[PDB]
């Protein structure tokens, strides 16, 4: 009834949300103590299938199941993450400066192996971490983390977007110049949708990600016209490249900003407005 | 709902202004999300891209990015539209105006045609502002793929025309009898190619390396279908597979592979959904609160969400 | 109590029963309705007079 | 006095129209 | 919330005025939307069509028509049971009752059908009134894809006999798919309904496509751009099948529309659209089995 909210009691080793901001896409981190055994499968024999336990064995390494599963990847984590993968520098050193700084980046290198060793072993990061929310409060101790961080629709960032514009509320950045892919180049006013676009390209640079937010006012079932186009990356020769999910209804066009405020100088962009309109991921070729 | 307004621009004829109040209840193809329209944006005028109307293929391409929504409500010089696609977050339950020969059923999947039967015409006119609005024929979601396969193979055949010239029809649909009559008019080449294309590429996906493992099964459907009544009504009498017997190969990657599941999955994914490829995607499921088991064709039929 | 007639004969003497006869309840709805338009409740209300 | 019951009607249901529909403890005005 | 009430049939036992106490948040799927109903409509003698008791393909058809249903509060001679499908997105938090697999924190829950584990599992069964219950499993969208392929893929091995492919490990959950005592000769012998469309739609999908680019393309960007993604991927498979395997218009342009409407319905007779989600608050999130969970509208 436009209201809704969330809780859970993560752990700090991820996202950390003292560092991090009022407005945060936290993602989730589903299922950890899975794959050895989907790592081993879903792919061909041809693809050293203990990668993914040894690589994430590593990274949990970097910091027993505990009293707290291992969630709360947030979007500020992956920006580092894939910010060697992605064509573009002096640009993406500046969120792995807000993470190095403010968030040990031997958390990164351990996980960026696993995006290459995901992608490797055929196991991809889309269908693992569904969108979890917008991080109303943190109540975080020295070792957990219970975040209201409220899911389900349209309200979810107005009740964080109504009362935002006295003090500091929400706003929702998209923490980078280069992601937030603004599409719509060729456009006009309307209101806009919101993805979240997982890129993929298998042994072109390695099983290369990029993680990024589009934004168009073009259905899920029209946006594969425009994510077949716009890419170089069609050249794998298997398949299942550019997965999406919904993220929502931008209702204000307008309202898509650049700035580069934060903390660290961290270039970013206000997101006045936002339908939360959670959706579900894509993948087929 | 994210009620969109759509301005009634210049004078009104005094029958056109009745135009509107009849439409209460059809679907708005509207190319944005706007709290605020002109009309000409919706009429088909607009659907007209460069030089030429898109045929009966085309308009589905039209279609496709571009928005549906509701009529709820009619007033001279607005129409307040419910955007199905976004604003259908209602305890409201917008209805819709059943406008084809067909009795849908209660909870069937509603999909969009463009008219294509012979006396579904709709078009109506405009004689203050020259504006046609071909209003689109919902129609539930068995009736609308089984539309969408005869138009596309009538498109194939106005590729190459080798047999002499008595082709079948393909233009003959039976919905619990009644022999309906499509428009079988002109083929535009792109709006061929474009869903032509689509539909090839689909099915290439669909063969993995464990589909072939399927292909051995061929004899074993036709000993069943020789003993199994439920069998020989599924290999149809017009079917290739009943002309394709007139193989396991082991070239094991591995030994342990799961060979069949993904096959499955695969064909899942990539030639199962066809309807949402070709035609548009079901978002119109029938909701009947008083207890009616069936919506008449030009009824009024309250509306929830996706299937 | 059923009527009964007392009986003559060498029969056995023919087992009385006099008992509170049980029965079934149905349940029956009978529902009604009717509608009330957009209008008359912003009228009717004070609301838009 | 086609002025003062315009002013007046509008004064009424600005403020019945937020919180005034309930009745209070005892006297509203 | 509009919660329709089900009407209990008249005098039942003592067990079964118990029975249906336990069924407090189960998932029950009514046909129309009426707020008196009966019981006998929501049992499963009502799902009887072509007069037997249907299969797990009638039921997956059944289960994509009528509306789904969470009980919300057992009451004497009533049923108050609140649809999903009704009410605007994430409104109206009721529970759901769990079974095997985890239902996280979110996962997007599908109502599937009840012969996916045990058969006479759940088969609530009043002996007053002689009807029969059969309450349908809440699994989440990947687990659900993925163990609905994974059945119909065993019965293949079946059909035609000579790895076991019944593991499927989840994060915490060993998940014991088998059980072979009793249940495998009766689970394969139900999805004797499935599995023949699934071979059939799978091999009038490949031997069509196998006579239609031989008797294509050679009569524009049609050839170009499909011969562009397919270069010695399907291509090698072409020789392959057209060699170990054998090869008229007419009967194809007539099989065309058929296929295409029958591998069109089991898009939406499998792949298990999500109809609810779980969306927590003051909650641990990860739901025992058997355990109630915050369960809301839309995904």
Same mark, same amino acid.
């Given at each position: 009834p436009?209201?809704?909210?969330?809780?859970?009691? &993560?752990?700090?080793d991820?996202?950390?949300?003292?560092?991090?901001?009022a407005?945060?896409?936290?993602?989730?981190?589903?299922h950890?103590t899975?794959?050895?055994?989907?790592?081993?499968?879903?792919?061909?024999?041809?693809?050293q &299938?203990?990668?993914?336990?040894e690589?994430?064995?590593?990274?949990?390494?970097?910091?027993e199941?505990?009293?707290?599963?291992?969630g709360?990847?947030?979007?500020?984590?992956?920006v580092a993450?894939?910010?060697?993968?992605?064509?573009?520098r002096?640009?993406?050193?500046?969120?792995?400066?807000?993470?190095?700084?403010?968030?040990?980046?031997?958390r990164?290198?351990?996980?960026?192996?696993?995006?290459?060793?995901?992608?490797?072993?055929?196991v991809?990061?889309?269908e693992?971490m569904?969108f979890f929310?917008?991080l109303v409060?943190w109540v975080?101790?020295?070792?957990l983390?219970?975040?209201?961080?409220?899911?389900?629709?349209?309200?979810?960032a107005?009740? &964080?977007?109504?009362?935002?514009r006295?003090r500091?509320?929400?706003?929702?950045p998209?923490?980078?110049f280069?992601?937030?892919?603004?599409?719509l180049?060729?456009?006009?006013?309307?209101?806009?949708?919101l993805?979240?676009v997982?890129?993929?390209?298998?042994?072109?640079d390695?099983?290369?990600?990029?993680?990024?937010?589009?934004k168009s006012?073009?259905?899920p079932?029209?946006?594969?016209?425009?994510?077949?186009?716009?890419?170089?990356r069609?050249?794998?020769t298997?398949? &299942?490249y550019?997965?999406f999910?919904?993220?929502?209804?931008?209702?204000?066009?307008?309202?898509?900003?650049?700035?580069?405020?934060e903390?660290?100088?961290?270039?970013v962009?206000?997101?006045?407005?936002?339908?939360?309109?959670?959706?579900?991921?894509?993948?087929?070729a | 709902?994210?009620?969109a307004?759509? !301005?009634?621009?210049?004078?009104?004829?005094?029958?056109?202004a009745? !135009?509107?109040?009849?439409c209460?209840?059809?679907?708005?193809?509207l190319?944005?999300?706007?709290?605020?329209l002109?009309?000409?944006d919706?009429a088909?005028?607009s659907?007209?891209?460069g030089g030429?109307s898109?045929?009966?293929?085309?308009?589905?391409?039209?279609?496709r990015?571009?928005?549906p !929504?509701?009529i709820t409500?009619?007033?001279?010089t607005?129409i307040?539209?419910?955007?199905?696609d976004?604003?259908?977050?209602h !305890?409201?339950?917008?209805?819709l105006?059943?406008?084809?020969?067909v009795?849908?059923?209660?909870?069937?999947?509603?999909?969009?045609?463009p008219?294509?039967?012979?006396?579904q015409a709709?078009?109506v006119?405009?004689?203050?502002?020259?504006?046609?609005?071909r209003?689109?024929?919902?129609?539930?979601?068995p009736?609308?793929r089984e539309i969408?396969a005869?138009?596309?193979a009538?498109?194939?055949?106005?590729?190459?025309?080798?047999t002499?010239?008595?082709?079948?029809?393909?233009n003959?649909?039976y919905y619990?009898?009644?022999?309906?009559?499509?428009? =079988?008019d002109?083929?535009?080449?792109?709006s061929?190619?474009?869903?032509?294309?689509?539909?090839?590429?689909?099915?290439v996906?669909?063969?993995?390396?464990?589909?072939?493992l399927?292909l051995?099964?061929?004899?074993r459907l036709?000993?069943?279908?020789?003993?199994?009544?439920?069998?020989? =009504?599924?290999?149809?009498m017009?079917?290739?597979?009943?002309?394709? =017997?007139?193989?396991?190969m082991?070239?094991?990657?591995?030994?342990?592979?799961?060979?069949?599941?993904?096959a499955?999955?695969?064909?899942?994914?990539?030639?199962?959904?066809?309807?949402?490829?070709l035609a548009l995607?079901?978002?119109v499921?029938?909701?009947?609160?008083?207890?009616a088991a069936?919506?008449?064709?030009?009824?009024?039929?309250?509306?929830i969400?996706?299937? | 109590?059923?009527?009964?007639?007392a009986?003559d004969?060498?029969?056995?003497?023919?087992?009385?029963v006099?008992?509170?006869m049980?029965?079934?309840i149905d349940?029956?709805?009978?529902?009604?309705?009717f509608?009330?338009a957009?209008?008359?409740?912003?009228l009717?209300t004070?609301?838009?007079? | 006095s086609?002025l003062?019951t315009?002013?007046?009607?509008?004064?009424?249901?600005?403020?019945?129209?937020?919180?005034?529909?309930?009745?209070?403890?005892?006297?509203?005005?």
């Amino acid at each position: 009834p436009r209201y809704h909210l969330t809780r859970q009691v &993560t752990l700090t080793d991820l996202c950390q949300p003292n560092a991090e901001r009022a407005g945060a896409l936290l993602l989730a981190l589903r299922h950890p103590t899975d794959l050895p055994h989907l790592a081993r499968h879903r792919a061909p024999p041809g693809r050293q &299938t203990e990668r993914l336990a040894e690589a994430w064995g590593q990274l949990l390494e970097a910091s027993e199941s505990g009293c707290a599963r291992a969630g709360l990847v947030s979007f500020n984590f992956l920006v580092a993450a894939c910010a060697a993968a992605y064509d573009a520098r002096d640009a993406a050193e500046a969120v792995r400066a807000h993470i190095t700084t403010n968030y040990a980046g031997a958390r990164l290198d351990r996980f960026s192996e696993c995006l290459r060793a995901m992608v490797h072993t055929h196991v991809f990061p889309h269908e693992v971490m569904r969108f979890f929310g917008g991080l109303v409060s943190w109540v975080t101790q020295d070792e957990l983390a219970s975040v209201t961080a409220v899911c389900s629709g349209p309200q979810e960032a107005t009740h &964080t977007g109504h009362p935002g514009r006295p003090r500091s509320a929400v706003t929702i950045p998209a923490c980078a110049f280069v992601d937030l892919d603004a599409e719509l180049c060729l456009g006009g006013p309307g209101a806009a949708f919101l993805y979240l676009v997982f890129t993929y390209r298998q042994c072109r640079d390695q099983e290369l990600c990029c993680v990024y937010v589009v934004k168009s006012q073009l259905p899920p079932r029209g946006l594969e016209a425009a994510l077949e186009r716009l890419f170089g990356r069609l050249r794998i020769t298997t398949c &299942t490249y550019a997965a999406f999910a919904e993220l929502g209804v931008m209702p204000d066009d307008s309202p898509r900003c650049l700035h580069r405020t934060e903390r660290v100088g961290v270039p970013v962009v206000i997101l006045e407005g936002v339908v939360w309109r959670p959706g579900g991921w894509r993948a087929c070729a | 709902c994210f009620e969109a307004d759509i !301005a009634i621009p210049s004078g009104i004829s005094r029958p056109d202004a009745a !135009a509107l109040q009849r439409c209460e209840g059809r679907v708005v193809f509207l190319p944005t999300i706007r709290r605020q329209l002109a009309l000409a944006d919706v009429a088909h005028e607009s659907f007209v891209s460069g030089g030429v109307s898109p045929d009966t293929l085309g308009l589905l391409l039209a279609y496709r990015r571009r928005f549906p !929504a509701v009529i709820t409500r009619v007033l001279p010089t607005r129409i307040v539209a419910c955007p199905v696609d976004l604003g259908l977050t209602h !305890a409201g339950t917008v209805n819709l105006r059943n406008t084809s020969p067909v009795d849908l059923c209660n909870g069937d999947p509603v999909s969009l045609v463009p008219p294509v039967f012979e006396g579904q015409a709709t078009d109506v006119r405009l004689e203050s502002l020259d504006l046609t609005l071909r209003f689109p024929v919902p129609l539930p979601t068995p009736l609308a793929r089984e539309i969408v396969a005869r138009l596309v193979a009538r498109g194939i055949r106005d590729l190459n025309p080798r047999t002499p010239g008595e082709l079948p029809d393909l233009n003959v649909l039976y919905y619990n009898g009644a022999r309906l009559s499509l428009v =079988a008019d002109v083929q535009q080449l792109a709006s061929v190619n474009t869903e032509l294309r689509s539909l090839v590429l689909n099915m290439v996906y669909s063969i993995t390396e464990g589909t072939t493992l399927i292909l051995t099964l061929i004899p074993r459907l036709l000993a069943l279908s020789a003993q199994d009544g439920y069998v020989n =009504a599924l290999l149809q009498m017009q079917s290739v597979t009943r002309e394709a =017997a007139q193989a396991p190969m082991l070239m094991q990657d591995g030994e342990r592979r799961l060979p069949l599941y993904e096959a499955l999955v695969a064909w899942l994914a990539h030639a199962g959904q066809l309807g949402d490829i070709l035609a548009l995607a079901p978002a119109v499921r029938v909701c009947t609160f008083d207890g009616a088991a069936v919506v008449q064709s030009g009824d009024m039929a309250p509306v929830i969400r996706y299937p | 109590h059923q009527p009964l007639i007392a009986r003559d004969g060498p029969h056995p003497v023919e087992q009385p029963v006099h008992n509170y006869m049980t029965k079934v309840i149905d349940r029956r709805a009978l529902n009604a309705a009717f509608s009330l338009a957009t209008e008359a409740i912003a009228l009717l209300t004070g609301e838009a007079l | 006095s086609i002025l003062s019951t315009i002013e007046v009607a509008s004064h009424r249901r600005l403020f019945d129209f937020f919180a005034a529909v309930r009745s209070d403890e005892n006297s509203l005005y």
